[PDB]
Amino acid sequence: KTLCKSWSDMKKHLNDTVSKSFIGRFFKLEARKTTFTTELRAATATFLTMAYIITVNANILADSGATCSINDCSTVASSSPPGPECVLGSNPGYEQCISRVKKDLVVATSLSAMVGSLAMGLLANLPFGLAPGMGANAYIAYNVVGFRGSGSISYHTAMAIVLLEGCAFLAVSALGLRGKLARLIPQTVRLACAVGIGMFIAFVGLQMNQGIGLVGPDKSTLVTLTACAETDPVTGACLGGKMKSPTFWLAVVGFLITSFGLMKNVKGSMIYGIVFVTAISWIRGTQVTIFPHTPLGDSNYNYFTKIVDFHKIQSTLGAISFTEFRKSEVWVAFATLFYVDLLGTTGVLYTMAEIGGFVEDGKFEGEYAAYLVDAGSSVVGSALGVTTTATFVESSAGLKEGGKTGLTAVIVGLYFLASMFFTPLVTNVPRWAVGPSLVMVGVMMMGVVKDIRWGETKEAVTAFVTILLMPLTYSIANGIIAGIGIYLALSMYDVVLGVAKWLN
Amino acid sequence: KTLCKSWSDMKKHLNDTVSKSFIGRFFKLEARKTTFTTELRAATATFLTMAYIITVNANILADSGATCSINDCSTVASSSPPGPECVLGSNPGYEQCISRVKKDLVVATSLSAMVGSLAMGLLANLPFGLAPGMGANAYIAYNVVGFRGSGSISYHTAMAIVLLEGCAFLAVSALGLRGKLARLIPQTVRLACAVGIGMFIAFVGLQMNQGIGLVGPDKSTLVTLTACAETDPVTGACLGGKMKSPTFWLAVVGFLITSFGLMKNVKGSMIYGIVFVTAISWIRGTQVTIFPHTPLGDSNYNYFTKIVDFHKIQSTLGAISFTEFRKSEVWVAFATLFYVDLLGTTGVLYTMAEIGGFVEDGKFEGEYAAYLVDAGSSVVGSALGVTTTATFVESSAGLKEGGKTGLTAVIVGLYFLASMFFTPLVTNVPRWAVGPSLVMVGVMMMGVVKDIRWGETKEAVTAFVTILLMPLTYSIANGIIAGIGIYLALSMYDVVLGVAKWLN
Ligand SMILES: Nc1ncnc2[nH]cnc12
Ligand SMILES: Nc1ncnc2[nH]cnc12
Incomplete structure (x- = not known):
């Protein structure tokens, strides 16, 4: 019929008047042969393969106990709460603190993935997006700072390492000291370090208090399979009954339809595995609820019944302290985070330049203004309370559908603006829903092990x-x-x- | 000079009179073009790459607490020793029990690798050797029976599983139900199971009471790096001082000269890594001694000062009990050990038939009499107290030097006879010397991961x-x-x- 004919000739005309306006002259749409419409399809597929790191990053930096300390704990029958009693859960005052920090890390991830992606397109004309990168979330939150205030390095010092590493990665790039420095590392250590991070990040997403809850303590083998149904209220211990946890088996069903969606090539599928096992775990009454009848859970449901909200950063804003840089284990955390970013944004950013055909005999057309936008965005991401950024490999779903200019990356920057307003739906994802998403990251990084x-x-x-x-x-x-x-x-x-x- | 000329013409004549005698007619040395001398070189290189599993198998089935039980423990100030106090060490009566069982597992491994290898050559005419195979040592000793009498299945039942699996692998092979059965398993599960066993067997060779002592308990991360110098006397706990253990760093030097010997292609090298870090740990007085001044250590040194001994099996001889086959977790241990032997001796025994050129369009000349000799030897190995046998891949060092008949496998069977008489030198290998040998097994099985x-x-x-x-x-x-x-x-x-x- 003429219904699709009236739809097709408008898209022949809307793609002309964009190219006949000024916005086709800045992004240079006449050369790099493409239209306005197929850029919008290139940014829709880039966002859906990237929308999982808006919730994984919030539920993994809130386990760090970001700004909640011992002073804003509750009051109990004693005169004062002791040291390790507050920071291990089961408290009216500390748990309401950590529900106001996870609301300050969902907004602080979208504002970090806006500025990284919106400045990549406007300054370099390259079709990929930015967000706080996976792999260095777990190093700061679980290994430098640790699970709820453990370790030695406080969180204010960990956000000062990201500044001083961020400024060290501009002025190792602006001088030209990259090919001199990155080729010094041999191929096998560079390639096997990306496999072991994938197995550390998945062992995180199996533990009792971190993710689902398979592995657990044992007094003779030092790790055993628990998956126990009736556990301890205060701490996590197996009282009895293996493999019959309703929060374990609901997470396995999310792991299948994530994997059954990646084969058959559904673009965004890790977001539909999170939404399915969350939308069951919102009905009050069941055993898999995130909304119990406690006073610690009525305040999350009374914030959930509204579905949109404009929320402002108020706790994990600019919080820097250089008053702890004169001891030993701060610099060891510095030289590790400088190491994993040098190998992350070197093998990726050139590999994503040969797909789509930008490259000539070296030196593709956005060399010098992509090493610095990827570096300065960690500086502006450190004031807001999140970790370093990285050029994502999921941005390849937009390279295989015809995205070749910087208008791809601007539209990706505008979905993150249109997803900070849905804050009451994103803080309420349970930690067993984010569990299998930490395991499919380890599957996709082990796929490089056949080149060692x-x-x-x-x-x-x-x-x-x-x-x-x-x-x-x-x-x-x-x-x-x-x-x-x-x-x-x-x-x-x-x-x-x-x-x-x-x-x- | 004529000195080597007088040496060379004798080897031209000694190779004739062997082929002109009757022993060249049985092994068929006229065809399969080879001589008597280059068979002896093919069996010397086969033994030296195989001599490590005479000590690894004894030091990994003595950790199982084979026949030592609660009744032959010591006597203390109480009227009776309780349950878990004896089997965790530090006892005058239980530790002298386990020094008489490790002397009954060094002899019981050579008598199991004799009969497996001496019956492979005489009945099938194939040039490879047999011994109790690595991979199923750790499943019975650490996962079915467990570390010193833990778990549920006793050791008498674990030696009855090996009989009933051994008889189930003759009469699944004599009927012809192998190609019908083994091809039912898909390629990826078959190939990835051999990688995960390699990572389980190396995590064994890092623990505090098993091997060297890197990893250890932690109350918030469930595993941490200890390597601690001054530890607890009774149990294993870190009292203070990381990475300064003299038993940790002496084991790392054994891990280097094992790996520095495998490259440059020294044939036996895992045996020279064990001998070097043992021959330092025999001098009385140091901190790395296996011979302290305790009464529990004077009895090992007074047995060491003699260097040869004819020792007889007296504890872990025929010990079978079918009185526990009417519960659940016995059959699950049965179907696992039947699984890992079906995939071990199928991908190996055909791969070692295409090197050396035995094969035609299927059906090499020793098909039917090699599936049964590899199966009946687990039956005769189960009465003597050790686990299932397997055709070793180290037997390839004899396929690449000209071994093509069964006289290779008979001479390999005669070095194991000439190495059961050196029992006082083999029981006294320390558990940190056998540590890196369990790690280089995991290196050589992960090398198949590039085919998944x-x-x-x-x-x-x-x-x-x-x-x-x-x-x-x-x-x-x-x-x-x-x-x-x-x-x-x-x-x-x-x-x-x-x-x-x-x-x-
Ligand atoms: N750190 C990172 N670098 C590149 N691509 C990524 N995708 C997810 N995390 C990433
Ligand atoms: N179980 C086994 N099978 C084959 N070759 C081996 N080498 C060591 N252990 C082995």
């Missing part, structure tokens, strides 16, 4: 120690250090002595 | 859950079950319903 040269022995001993010691010793710093230490001693003690025997 | 199809999603979700849940939940049964359960639900719920929609 397992033929030679020195390349396989170095790659095995780095992969193994990251999820076991519960440390990312103990896999980077114990990989370089094996790679030198197997190599320096015969080759370097042999070169120094012949160079003189 | 990480392209498709169903092949990568199934392979990731199987690899991850074996070293974490400390279970081999929880990786086989949780791999099939993901592989059906991603596949049966759309394909099988679609086939049943079209078949009718």
Whole structure:
């Protein structure tokens, strides 16, 4: 009929008047042959494969106990609450503190993914998006700061490391010291570190108080399968009954329809696994509720019955303190976070330049203004309370549908503006819904393990120690250090002595 | 000179009179073109790459607490010793029991690797050797029986599972039900199960009471790096001082010269890593001694000062009890050990037949009499107290030097006879010397991970859950079950319903 004919000739005309206006001259839409309409399809598919890190990042930096401390705890029958009693849960005053910080990290992630993505398109003309990157969320929140105020480094110092690393990554890039520096790292340590982070981030998404709750303590094997139904109220311990938890099996169904959606190539599928096992866990009354009948849960439901809200940052705003940079374990956390960002935004940003055909004999057309926008956005992301940004590989779903200019990245920046207003629906995602989303990240990073040269022995001993010691010793710093230490001693003690025997 | 000329013409004549005697007619040395001398070189290189499993198997089945029970414990100030006080160490009576069982498992491994290897050559004419296979040592000793009498299944029942699995693997092979049965298992579950066993067997060789002592307990992260120097006398706990254990750093030096020996292609190298960090840990006086000044250690040194001994099996001889086969977790241990032997001796025994050129369009010349000798040897190995046998992949070092007949496997059977008489030197290998040997096994099994199809999603979700849940939940049964359960639900719920929609 002429109904679709009246629909098709308008899209032949709306794509002309955009290119005949001024906005086609800035983004250069005449060359880089494309139209206005197929840029909008390139940014819709980029956002849906990227919309999961708006909730994963909030539910993983609220476990850090961001600004809640011992002073704003509750009052009990004693004269004063002691040290470790408040920060392990079951409190009227501390749990209402941490419900006002997760509302300040959903807004602070959209405002960090706006500025990173909206400044990528306007300054570099490149079709990809930015957000706080996955992989360095778990290093700061679980290994530097730790689960609810553990560890040694406070959260105010951890947001000062991101500034001083962010300013160290502009002025190692503006001088030209990148190809001199990144090629110094060998291929096997660079490639096996991305596998071990994928196994650390999935062992996070299995524990009792972190994600679903499979693994647990044991007094002779040091880890065992619990999955227990009736557990301890105060702490997490198995009282009895294995594999019959209604919060465990509802999370497995979310893990299947995420994986049954990735095959058959549904673009956004990790967002539909989160929405399905959340929309069951909102009905009051069941055993899988996030809304119980406690006074600690009536305040979340009375905020849920309104579906939109304009919420402002008020707790985890600019909070920096350089008054702790004169001890030892601050700089070790500095040299680790400088290491994992140098290898994250180097192998990705050039690989996403050869898809779509930007590249010539080196030096694609947005080289110099993409290393700095990816670096300055960690500085503006550190004042707002979140971690470093990274150019996402999910942005490839927009490279395979015809996005080639910077109008892709501006529209991606405008869905994050249209998703900070839905704050009452995003703070209320349960921690067993975000569990399988931390496991499918580990599936997609282990897919690079078929490029490690397992033929030679020195390349396989170095790659095995780095992969193994990251999820076991519960440390990312103990896999980077114990990989370089094996790679030198197997190599320096015969080759370097042999070169120094012949160079003189 | 004529000195080597007088050496070379004798080896031209000694190789003739062996082939002109009757012993060249049985093994058929005229065809399969080879001589007597280069068979002896093929069996020397086969033994040295196989001599490590004479000490690893004894030091991993003595941690099981094989026949030592609560009745032959010591006597203390109380009227009777309680249950868990004896079996956790620090006892005059229980520790002298377990020093008489490790002397009955060094002899029982050589007598099991004799009969398996000496009957492979005489009945099948194939050049490889047999011993109790690595991979099923840790399943029985740490996961069925457990560390020193833990768990539910006693050791007398675990040696009855090996009989009833051994007799079930003759009469699934003699009827012809192997190609019908083994091809039913898909490729990804078959291939990823061999990677997760390699990561379970290496997490064993890092713990505080098992191997060296890196990982340890923690009350908030459930695993942490201890490596602590001054520990608890009774139990294992970190009192203070990280990374300064003299038993930790002596084990790292053994891990380097094992790995520095595998590259540059030294044939036996895992045996020279064990001998070097043992021969330092025999000098009385140091901090790394295996011979302290206790009465529990004077009895090991007074047995060490003699260097040869004829020792007889007296504790872990024929000990079978079918009086526990009417409960649940016995058969689950049966179907796991039947699973891992079906996939171990199928992908190996055909791969070791295409090297050396035995094969034609299927059906190499020792098909039917090698599935049964590999199966009947687990029956005769179960009466003597050790686990199932397997055709070793280290036997390939003899396939690449010209071994093609059964005289290779007979001579391998005669080095194990000449290494049961050195029992006082083999019981005295410390548990931190056997530690890195359990880690280089995990390096050599992870080298098959570059053949898993990480392209498709169903092949990568199934392979990731199987690899991850074996070293974490400390279970081999929880990786086989949780791999099939993901592989059906991603596949049966759309394909099988679609086939049943079209078949009718
Ligand atoms: N840190 C990161 N770098 C690149 N792509 C990512 N996708 C998710 N996290 C990422
Ligand atoms: N179980 C096993 N099967 C084959 N080769 C092996 N090498 C060591 N253990 C083995």
